[PDB]
Amino acid sequence: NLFFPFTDAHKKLLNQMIRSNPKLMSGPFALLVKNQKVLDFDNKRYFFNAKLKSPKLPITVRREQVFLDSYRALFFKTNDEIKNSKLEITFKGESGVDAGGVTREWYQVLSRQMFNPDYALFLPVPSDKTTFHPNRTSALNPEHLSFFKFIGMIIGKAIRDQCFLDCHFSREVYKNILGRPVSLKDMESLDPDYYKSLVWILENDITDIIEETFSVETDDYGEHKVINLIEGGKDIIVTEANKQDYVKKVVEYKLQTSVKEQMDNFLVGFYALISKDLITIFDEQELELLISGLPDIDVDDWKNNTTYVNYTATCKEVSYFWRAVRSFDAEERAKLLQFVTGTSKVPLNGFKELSGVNGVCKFSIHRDFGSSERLPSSHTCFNQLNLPPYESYETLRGSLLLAINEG
């Protein structure tokens, strides 16, 4: 509870001094990666763009089909020709409308065209249908492996060109870009029913109630193919000792292994323009704010479309929460969104239509009841925040920021 008011003020002073004299860092760039858990996102964004500076490429595309045209126009350009060139985008017809602004909207329309179901590239995420995760059955488009490599190439090029993309993904996508491992809490936003299942397995005695094998059956492409999680998992019965390993092995396959090659291609196109050992300055929450951008959220429209369960409006904890939210900066407010709703994207119609797994799930603030010595938790499917009853406002603020940044 104590040291909470200090460690936040300490972090703000360190970053402020680095803004004043960025030469104070100097040295190897890898040291910034090693001590990222204290660096400001804007300072990270600064030193990132710094090391990123160490010709002209004419492209003409039809606005109706900017995805395939850009794909075919850059299909034979090498990585060096794409990493080191100024894209001069032209539209067949509608020519001479504007200058370099065409490139900014060239990225925007290209961002929406990626998720066209006609390509079978991405499937919508259940927590927020406006966010997408890769389609495990992307083999319907037989050239999909060249598409994910093309997509990661565009995402990385937009990062180099300081252009924001209206594309937001599930959290494990950014974690794969950074090489970070997935968690069971990632399964929440992608399949809350399976999450509730796996959580029950880890919480209850499964001696005779449930039984499984270390294998997964996928009725995919008219075949009952059974894949072994571990060697011989088709026959390894799940017990109580291997219970923790089963959930971990299951989550790994259901998330990363089931889309291993599409992600590998995606990373090949991405790492070809943004090296892994300098994109890893950012965590999975900051990486979304790099590509899409920091949102400008309306705390008023947020609190006006906020419900409270086992709490009340004008409560002591609720007063602490909003006095803390309004005391957060753009980075911490964005990560508070990402903590609860799972994304950094505010709905176009406002928080009054904040979507969830079942539909319009407005922002809920539940109550933890158990031990004020826990950090706040969240469920991205229902946009609810479990907030324990904290006595002091500063204990709430530090415990929020401790869950907001970390994870």
Numbering used by the authors: 2850 to 2903, 2909 to 3261
Paper excerpt:
Tom1p is a large, 374 kDa member of a broadly conserved family of HUWE1 factors (also called Mule, Lasu, Ureb1, Arf-BP1, HectH9/E3^Histone^, Ptr1, Upl1, or Eel-1;). This family is characterized by a large N-terminal domain attached to a smaller C-terminal HECT domain (Homologous to E6-AP Carboxyl Terminus) that provides ubiquitin ligase activity ([Fig fig1]). Tom1p has been implicated in the turnover of excess levels of small, basic proteins including ribosomal components and histones. We determined cryo-EM structures of Tom1p to reveal a helical repeat solenoid architecture for the 2,888 residues preceding the C-terminal HECT domain and an overall architecture that resembles the published structures of HUWE1 but with a larger fraction of ordered residues.
